[PDB]
Design a binder for this molecule. Structure first.
Ligand code: QUI
Ligand code: QUI
Ligand code: CL
Ligand code: CL
Ligand code: K
Ligand code: ZN
Ligand code: ZN
Ligand code: ZN
Ligand code: ZN
Ligand code: ZN
Lengths: 10, 8
DNA sequence: ACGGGCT
DNA sequence: AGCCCGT
């Protein structure tokens, strides 16, 4: 996720 | 065919 | 027939 | 530690 907590996705 | 991790 | 991307 | 797709 994010970053943080990429995306999703990417 | 999506690329959201692979992109085929 | 397919695995990616930083805070 | 943190998710999830379409031709
Ligand atoms: C892309 O649209 C798509 C849909 N289904 C798949 C299944 C398996 C591999 C790649 C795929 N790509
Ligand atoms: C891409 O690396 C990747 C991996 N697993 C998945 C599961 C479900 C939807 C999309 C995905 N993409
Ligand atoms: Cl999978
Ligand atoms: Cl903990
Ligand atoms: K924990
Ligand atoms: Zn897979
Ligand atoms: Zn991976
Ligand atoms: Zn880690
Ligand atoms: Zn899963
Ligand atoms: Zn599908």
């Amino acid at each position: 996720t994010x970053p943080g907590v990429t995306x999703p996705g990417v | 065919x999506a690329x959201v991790x692979a992109x085929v």
